[PDB]
Design a protein around this nucleic acid. Structure first.
Ligand SMILES: Nc1ncnc2c1ncn2[C@@H]1O[C@H](COP(=O)(O)OP(=O)(O)O)[C@@H](O)[C@H]1O
Lengths: 107, 95, 78, 91, 31, 442, 97, 78, 107, 93
DNA sequence: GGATGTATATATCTGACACGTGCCTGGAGACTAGGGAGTAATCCCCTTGGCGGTTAAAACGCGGGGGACAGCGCGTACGTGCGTTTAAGCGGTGCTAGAGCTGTCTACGACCAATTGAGCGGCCTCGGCACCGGGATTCTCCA
DNA sequence: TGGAGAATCCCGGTGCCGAGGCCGCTCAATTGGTCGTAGACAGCTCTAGCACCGCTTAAACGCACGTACGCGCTGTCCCCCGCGTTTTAACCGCCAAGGGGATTACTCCCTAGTCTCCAGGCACGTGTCAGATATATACATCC
């Protein structure tokens, strides 16, 4: 019988089988649900999409064709909710959001 | 030219636009090998490991300066001074 | 005496990225002390992982772990 | 040695069909996904243990997303989760 | 020790000289 | 005065031999200089012969540097391999991954090479001499030829600013059109030759007496020669101007623009309407041929030449007009070849060989700037210039590609001019400039 | 007749309350607040007893630590009085906002 | 309402334990907002653990686990 | 043949067996080395001693025979190395170390 | 029924360091909490160390590297010593 | 009447992606076992609520005092720019330590069954502590 | 310095409840055995990191200078502290209802486990094309 990737059965560009391997072998529990990897893979795909959508936008606002680490930084630190999720994270080659205190600026 | 101060704020609008590493590579590397050899003699490093340390090290110092800046401004100063570093560290919990 | 290799120009640039307009002169010797204390803590951990794996070379991965041990997660290197 | 590279590119070609993504930015995405997997599978792990239960079901994942993701991001993720598991079960 | 190290130089030299020559052959001579 | 180099695998003609004598005397005096022979007298084999003479008498077996334009590199590789076959000749072109590997020939420690050494002559483009100057600056070049040297006429160019700082003994310029534009460009060639003597923009600036002044002043630094005194065996260029009148479509667009900075837009209309906007609400090929006066008049002339068993070099200034022309040649079912500056440097070798090897091919389409330099096309007989160049040296360079040594048929130059339009203005100015250049040499 | 000078009584207070272990919010009103927040999230929520005691230990520990940080922000500004701008600085440097 | 059940006198005391001599008058309303925003975050997590266990009763353990998801670890209740 | 607690077999007061049970049921990994629980038990005993010694001292310095939470709190915040281990920890019923800032004291 | 806890063992340690001293239930509750917390951390660290080395077993060596990572300074030294001693005695017996 | 900026071309090169062959290892399908989680019935404990009472503390009202604040002078530190000096960055050659992978086999830890004593629940109990009244001693404050 | 006087600590006597000891008993820790794979080990290839050399040229350094910030000092006036009195609701000790969590049994379906098979994805080549830098020429503009 022709094999149909679990991914395709659940419409998920993310690889549901690999997620099931890593949950099973990585000692998170004794037994893993068949529904576990499908749900978790849906959530990874959704977060991946969100960051790339915001970074894509920042690329085109800078008039450039290719996403780079500077744009991932600019994406992640604009969104209130993603910044709360990645507050501890340093992104290599990302640089800083432009920021001057209004006290420093000219009178 | 520029009124007194406009030049500092131009420095700001420069270095916030760039993404480059701000410490010189070879001096940084020598500091890392100096510190390392206390813990184990004959430690070989990978290029990428020293670059990792430098990215993290600059990220840490830059972030300390933002917190230091807020301490100054709260004291109605524009100048950061050692007291401001020490206050930020204690609040953040690095005592 | 390599910590003085972190030049005054450089501390000043870092400050500027952090949006500082004017810097005291005593800032330079504090900033050096600060940087060394942070690197000592991360390198000690990286070497601790390296020796556990019975390598002699400190890898990028050791360092990235050593930083996630301390709540400083460095995206970009394995 | 494996990476989630392939899949990130597929998501990108679908959300922004003209764009590409540099080698170093792809390395950042591979870092991000490994990080979040660990966080969610760790919370699921602990939830199971606190409840004296031996399987990480899909219900354990959903409570771990509700705990990790902040605010409206959570709502959207749990919706996406639930949709997909419904479709898979319907096969 | 010495034998393996001596042999490494000959093995390097052979490939280096051939790959050097192959590139001149890549450009000048018609391909 | 001096004997022919014993390594040289071909006989020098009398005027070539005298040229080698001049260059040898320059080297032994320690003076740098310009061989300025009119195009196709054989500057190349004279240049090569100095490398031979140095390698014989003073045992200076390299390293020697030829810098040349891209079209021309393969020519030199062949020429050195043919006329002094003992010399070992190293390309320095191609991708960065290639060029790294080639640097592994260079010996940085022996200052003067000998016969057993890895390479004797290096051939490289102007373009790589600029991009890779960082690496070149380490070498200790023993003799250096810039070929097609008006490449360096602009003193403000990165190229001049780079090549001035190449660490080397004797330099030779080749350029068959030394005199070009204003006297500042003549300064630039002189300074590149001898910096200490020609150190100042202003002092070189310091009128019939000034012209007579100059003729003596240049006599220690330049040798100029002209075809009619030594190439008496080859008849002069027959030059035939052809006029054309604008088509109705052309005329409409030209009036539209004139009613509406527009210099280059006028030049486009006179080439072909379709260089603005092509056509389809259905567009016929018969309309395409008829829609440009030039192309229409060209169609008459091509058909005649084909019937007579001639072969054509056809030059353009605009790259998209080469693209359009191929279509008309495709429909008229003529076999053709194409060479322009966008063409990869491998294919240059192949294409020129093809047109010189297999006379099924009727037309060579060439860009004027890429085609004008280096390539040797003795099997052709007819040159057509579809559009006028602002600079007369560039067209001169171009038509001399048909009128080399070893040409055996009467070279015929056609040139098409669109009456009452920018084309005329341009050819007018080019002829003024040619009179000035010709006077200053004269 | 007698008054202590402004501040002596406050320092009496610092010694006494820095020397006691006891919980400083009154129990019954804190308990009532916790259910007011809980009833947004799920209706009819029975609370264990030790759960509200644990919330109160965490709540007092959070605020007592916040006042320590706040106080340093004041003293650095050459004041002795804490003011709302001090609290907001402390929270921002500790990353909470 | 209930947030005003955290009395002014109460805050005054808390502050004293943190060794503050002189307290403003606008501190009080700010402190209440701070304490509510803390409690809302902890209670949401505690109720979320309670509902996954399908209990109706929030236990001490739910709270203790909620707090360990915030870097604030409480010893002496489970 | 007569039983010997692994604890006694390894000179320790903390329970080696129970530690081996928890390392097995805690999904910390697939296979659990034999000496692992012995070493882990030794360190738990060491840390337990270190705190209770300090707490005993704090209790005697306050004229009382029973350790209570407040004595643990004093003990733990008065030693730099224990405080660096437990900085994020709150101890219920613990109170605060007595510390008034010197600029607050009267003129 | 049977919840289980380390109070028994804490009493014995206290009796060896301070023979006359005792301990309130609340203090013992704190001690019981402390011990779970530290087991958790040292086991978790040892877990991840094994993973990063692509190994299936949590041996004594891993618990050593974990003590050296969590505990600061002299604490660490003195603990890694107690550990060596104990495992040496067991291996002997 | 000249020095320069602007606009539009060609000529080239370098590095990003699209496609390609190849190959291989892990994901898919399919078949069985047995134990975890799901079901309901039970039960006792601990939470929710009402009551009546005491009294600690929160709530309100005053002075007045000392701190937050605004302003000013002034003085020395910090920024600047010009000129010089030194090391960083490049790119090389070149050696070899050691990371990373393969193939063995042995020794060790998962798994089982039988035993038995450690440690839990529960019950009894008496001594450490809280608190209270009193006195003696210590800190503030103002004349 | 000197009394005043409110507060704090220390002493002492009561009494109460929870720390601490001892009794059954059940279940998990210990003993002795099997066995099968993890990983310690020996050996290998070859990546890549450490040394060391010369050259350009940029940033690092040093100095002379000046002006703007920091900050010490004063006058004002608001607002917090300290205290007193009234008011109110928290705390206590108690009785009760009853819901809801912890438990015991029991059954069934889900997931681990093994096997067979093949296509997804990883590594390495390559080629081709849009973007970036030079350079040429006219002409308008600014000087
Ligand atoms: N002795 C000779 N034998 C063959 N070819 C010769 C000889 N002398 C001159 N030539 C021709 O001289 C030509 C080169 O002319 P030259 O002016 O040097 O070229 P360019 O104008 O490109 O610099 C070649 O086509 C070559 O065949």
């Amino acid at each position: 019988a022709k094999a149909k990737t679990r991914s395709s059965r659940a419409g998920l560009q993310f690889p549901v089988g690999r997620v099931h391997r890593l949950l099973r072998k990585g000692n998170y529990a004794e037994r893993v649900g068949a529904g576990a990897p499908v749900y978790l893979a849906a959530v990874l795909e959704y977060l991946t999409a969100e960051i790339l959508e915001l970074a894509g936008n920042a690329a085109r606002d800078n008039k450039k064709t290719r996403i780079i680490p500077r744009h991932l930084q600019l994406a992640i630190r604009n969104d209130e909710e993603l910044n709360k999720l990645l507050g501890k994270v340093t992104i290599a080659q990302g640089g800083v959001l432009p920021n001057i205190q209004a006290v420093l600026l000219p009178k | 030219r520029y009124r007194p101060g406009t030049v500092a704020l131009r420095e700001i609008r420069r270095y916030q636009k760039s993404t480059e590493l701000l410490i010189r590579k070879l001096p940084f590397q020598r500091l890392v090998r100096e510190i390392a050899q206390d813990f184990k003699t004959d430690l070989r490093f990978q290029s990428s490991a020293v670059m990792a340390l430098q990215e993290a090290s600059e990220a840490y110092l830059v972030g300390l300066f933002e917190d230091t800046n807020l301490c100054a401004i709260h004291a109605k100063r524009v100048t950061i001074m050692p007291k401001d570093i020490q206050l930020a560290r204690r609040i953040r919990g690095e005592r | 005496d390599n910590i003085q290799g972190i030049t005054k120009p450089a501390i000043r640039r870092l400050a500027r990225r952090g949006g500082v307009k004017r810097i005291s002169g005593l800032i330079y010797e504090e900033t050096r002390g600060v940087l060394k204390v942070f690197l000592e803590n991360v390198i000690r951990d990286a070497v601790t992982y390296t020796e556990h794996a019975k390598r002699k070379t400190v890898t990028a991965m050791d360092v990235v772990y050593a930083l996630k041990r301390q709540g400083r997660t460095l995206y970009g290197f394995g | 040695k494996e990476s989630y590279s392939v899949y990130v590119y597929k998501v990108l070609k679908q959300v922004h069909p003209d764009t590409g993504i540099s080698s170093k930015a792809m390395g950042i995405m591979n870092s991000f996904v490994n990080d979040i997997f660990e966080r969610i599978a760790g919370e699921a792990s602990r939830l199971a243990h606190y409840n004296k239960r031996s399987t990480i079901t899909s219900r354990e994942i959903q409570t771990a997303v509700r705990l990790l993701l902040p605010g409206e991001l959570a709502k959207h993720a749990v919706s996406e989760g639930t949709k997909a598991v419904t479709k898979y079960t319907s096969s | 020790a010495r034998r393996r190290r001596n042999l490494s130089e000959k093995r390097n030299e052979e490939i280096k000289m051939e790959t050097v020559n192959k590139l001149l052959k890549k450009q000048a001579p018609r391909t | 005065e001096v004997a022919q180099p014993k390594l040289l695998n071909c006989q020098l003609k009398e005027y070539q031999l005298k040229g080698l004598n001049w260059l040898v005397n320059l080297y032994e005096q320690g003076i740098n200089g310009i061989l300025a022979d009119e195009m196709g007298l054989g500057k190349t084999v004279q240049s090569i012969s100095v490398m031979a003479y140095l390698a014989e008498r003073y045992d200076i077996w390299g390293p020697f540097l030829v810098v040349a334009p891209a079209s021309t590199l393969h020519n030199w590789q062949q020429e050195v391999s043919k006329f002094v076959p003992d010399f070992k000749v190293l390309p320095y072109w191609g991708t960065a991954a290639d060029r790294k590997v080639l640097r592994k020939f260079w010996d940085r420690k022996h200052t003067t090479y000998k016969k057993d050494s890895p390479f004797h002559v290096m051939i490289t483009s102007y373009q790589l001499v600029v991009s890779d100057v960082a690496y070149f600056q380490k070498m200790k070049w023993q003799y250096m030829i810039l070929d097609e040297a008006q490449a360096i006429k602009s003193s403000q160019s990165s190229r001049w600013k780079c090549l001035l700082g190449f660490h080397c003994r004797n330099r030779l310029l080749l350029t068959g059109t030394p005199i070009q534009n204003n006297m500042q460009e003549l300064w630039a060639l002189l300074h590149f030759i001898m910096p200490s003597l020609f150190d100042s923009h202003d002092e070189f600036s310091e009128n019939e007496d000034q012209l007579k002044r100059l003729h003596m002043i240049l006599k220690p630094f330049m040798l100029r020669r002209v075809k009619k005194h030594v190439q008496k065996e080859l008849g002069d260029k027959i030059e035939i101007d052809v006029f054309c009148e604008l088509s109705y479509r052309q005329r409409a667009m030209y009036q539209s623009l004139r009613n509406q900075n527009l210099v280059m837009q006028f030049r486009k209309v006179c080439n072909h309407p379709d260089l603005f906007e092509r056509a389809d609400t259905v567009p016929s090929m018969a309309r395409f041929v008829t829609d440009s006066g030039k192309l229409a008049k060209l169609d008459e002339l091509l058909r005649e030449l084909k019937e007579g068993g001639h072969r054509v070099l056809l030059y353009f200034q605009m790259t998209r007009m080469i693209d359009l022309m191929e279509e008309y040649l495709t429909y008229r079912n003529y076999k053709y070849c194409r060479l322009d500056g966008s063409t990869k440097l491998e294919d240059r070798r192949d294409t020129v060989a093809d047109f010189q090897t297999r006379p099924e091919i009727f037309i060579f389409l060439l860009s004027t700037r890429a085609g004008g330099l280096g390539i040797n096309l003795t099997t052709a007989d007819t040159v057509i210039f579809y559009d006028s160049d602002w600079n007369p040296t560039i067209d001169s360079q171009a038509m001399d590609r048909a009128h080399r040594l070893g040409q055996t048929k009467q070279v015929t130059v056609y040139r098409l001019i669109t009456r009452g339009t920018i084309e005329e203005r341009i050819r007018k100015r080019a002829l003024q400039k040619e009179e000035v250049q010709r006077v200053v040499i004269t």
